[PDB]
Structure formats: structure tokens, C-alpha cells
Paper text:
Here, we first report the structure of PDCoV Macro-Ubl2-PLpro from δ-CoV with 2.5 Å resolution. The Macro-Ubl2-PLpro monomer consists of three distinct domains: Macro, Ubl2, and PLpro. At the flanking N-terminus of the crystal structure, Macro adopts a conserved three-layered α-β-α sandwich fold, similar to the macroH2A variant of human histone 2A. The thumb, palm and finger domains form the catalytic core of PLpro, which has an extended right-hand architecture. At the tip of the finger domain, four cysteines (Cys334, Cys335, Cys360 and Cys363) from two β-hairpins that coordinate a zinc ion with a tetrahedral structure. The short BL2 in PDCoV PLpro causes the space for substrate binding to be much larger than the corresponding spaces of USP14 and other CoV PLPs. We determined that the active sites of PDCoV PLpro consist of Cys and His residues, similar to the active sites observed in many PLPs. Cys260 is located at the base of α9 of the thumb 3.6 Å from His398, which is situated at the base of the palm domain, while the third hypothetically conserved site aspartic acid (Asp412) is not well aligned with Cys260 and His298, the position of PDCoV PLpro Asp412 is quite inconsistent among other PLPs, and the possible explanation is that the Asp412 is located on the flexible loop connecting β19 and β20 (Figure 3(A) and Figure 6(A–C)).
Nsp3 is essential for the formation of the RTC, and it functions as a scaffold protein by interacting with itself and other proteins (including viral nsps and host proteins). PLpro is responsible for the hydrolytic release of nsp1/2 -nsp4; in addition to hydrolytic activity, PLpro also possesses deubiquitinating and deISGylating activities.
Residue numbers in the entry: 1 to 425
Amino acid sequence: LPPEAIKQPSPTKVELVVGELASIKFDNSVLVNPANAQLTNGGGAARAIAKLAGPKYQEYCNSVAPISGPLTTDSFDAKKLGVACILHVVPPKGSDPNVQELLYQAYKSILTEPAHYVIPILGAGIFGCNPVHSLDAFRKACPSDIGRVTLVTMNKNHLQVWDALNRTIVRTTTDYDQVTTKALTPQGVLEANLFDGEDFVQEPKPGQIYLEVTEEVQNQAKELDLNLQQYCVYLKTCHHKWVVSRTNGLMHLKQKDNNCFVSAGVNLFQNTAYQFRPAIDALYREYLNGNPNRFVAWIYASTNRRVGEMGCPQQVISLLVSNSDAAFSATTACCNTYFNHTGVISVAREYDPIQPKVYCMKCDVWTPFTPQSGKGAVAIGTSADEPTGPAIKFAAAHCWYTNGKKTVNGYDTKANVVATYHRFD
Ligand SMILES: [Zn+2]
């Protein structure tokens, strides 16, 4: 309570200092004395304080004789050093229940006013307490606004016990290949950019694996055109085992786990003349050689599906084509307007599996067209008519590639066609 010891609230910054009490950099400090009820100052920190405060200090302690609760005392001789006063508390002797509660109510007993505290860690001695409990009791009791605080050790292993108690164990990956377990400070946790699969996480649950979103992660996602939710899905789907198989001139993705929407899209694509942009052609040349894993996982993450779930083959072929060099120019049949078109044609009305069309804004009709450049075009829509070239048919929640002439990788019933490829010749 001495008025010269008061400092107005400030965010607490604890410091754990090495050597003995005489060493400390004081500042009108409250020096804590871990004592017995008779203030004999027998040994430990308590005798080191007693032979610092002087003999008149020790006589006044004998006057007041047995102490039941904490006692505040002037600092006597130690005032020269910057000690405003001395606070006496009786640690529990670490051999009784419950010692860590009494440890906690000992530090609570100490840290009550906004002052600079210097504290020998409680429970030293062979009659003492586990120092990890003491350091833990202290963080449980330390208020958040009580500025600079100094603990005092002389054990040189306690700087680790301290560092560990203020770190949380986090499992992280950039990969879903190698997983790394880290001990992070509440600062390191936010520097880690821990990602849940949905959102960033500033208190990780134990045992759970988090994506550490480095800048290499961000660049990889963007090379693949995925946000981070998608990128996580992508990394995990790379672990699915698939079988691919040369059949009908193309590498086919064996039916499994509702993946037909993928095989149908990739098989149409294989019967066009398009070339993927560099990042994606790298996945694709793996698939074409027997490593379907990355390319297929990219398909699922780009179209927001999970393996086992069944998706849209138009989604797939449109994803593939837009990541390629697909483009053509032409003139309309309705008014001979020149135009350019990249990606698939989405023929929303008047879809004709043997006559591809575009929408003319001028005449407000779905018109055929005469190509001036490019190699072909993919059209998507739905009609019951039959195609005469590479197409995709969808019926009864199954979908499959068919070249124009029966030539099928699935059934040969009546089915809507949902995508067709039209070469220009
Ligand atoms: Zn027109």
C-alpha cells in the first residue's frame, strides 16, 4: 500500500529473471518474502531478504511474532535498492491437499494492487512444491493490467517450464502430407494463419490438424484457381485412390464413388483439341500417365463436390474448357455480325446437339454461326435429340461419354444429351 509504489494500470509483461534477489533491477517495488508463520527467515529467499533489509527488520518481525495472513512491512535497509516494502506470505508446504489451490490463493494473496512485484517462485526447498504448478498457479492468478512483474528463480530450468506453460501445442500442415506439431505463443498462433477448412482459427483445439496458410499456400491455391476452402478439399482429395485405364483411345476413370460426372467430363475433353494452361496441363499429364489423383482432386474442389457425392458433368467440361486455350471467332447466320467466344457455349434455349448456336443480342434469337478461327466449340444445354459426335448423356443420375456413333462408355438407352463437341471442318 505505500503511495510511492503505485503505478497506474498497464498491460502486464511478466519477466522471469535468473540470479538472486540482490541482483534485481528495482523500482519502488513490492518484494515478496516467502516466509513461515514465525518469520524466522530461516533460509531460502526469506533469509536472503532478511540480510538485505537489516537487523532492525528482523527485530520488528519477531515483535509481530506469529502471522496468520499476509503482512506488509517497510523495506528498512533495502530501501536504498528501490524496494518500497516487503510482503510476507506463507506458501503451502506442497505435501497436502490441495497444494495447487493453496498455491493459487497465495499468488492471489500477493497480486492485489497496481505495483511492481518481485516474486521468488513459491514452493522452493526440499519441503517445496512442483515448480510447474507454482508457475501455473501464478498465471492463473496474475491480473491482466498489473504492468511489469518480476519472478526470481536460480534454477535455470524454470525459464523453460515458464516458456512451455505459455505455449499451446498445435498440429499444422501446408500439405496434408507432412504434419508438424508446434508449440506456439498466442502471438505465434496468429502468425501461423491457422486455417480450419472454413475460416482462420485463433485458438486451436488440441489434436486437430490445421492448414498453416503460408504465402506458398496462397500462391498454390491461386495457381489452381481455388480459394482456401476449396484448396483444403483439394489437398485431402489427393489421397483418394482411383483406377485409370486406356479404353476406346482415351484414358478412362474407372467408375467409383459417384465419380461418373468426372469421367464423362474428362472423356469429352480428351476428344477435343484444347490445351490446358501450364499449371493444369501438369496435373493432366499425370492423369494421362496413370496418376489421376491431383487432376481429379482439382476437379472436385473446383466444382465444390466431395467424393461419394454426385455432381454435374456440364460443370466439369466447362471447368476444363475455360482452363484451356479454347476460343473461336465467327459470324452470325441471322445478321453476319462478327464475334469472339472463349470457353464453352451455354446454349440456354434451342439447344441442338448437331447445330451449335449463340445468342445474338441484335436480333434476339439463338442463331447458328460460321467459324472464322479456332478448332471447335463445346456447347452445353439439354435436349432429348441424339448427337452425331462426341457428347455427354445424362439419365437416371448416371452420365457417360459417347462418341457420336453409339461408341459408349456407359448405357445405350434414351437419355438427354447435356454437352457436345463440334469440330470445325
Ligand atoms: Zn443477329
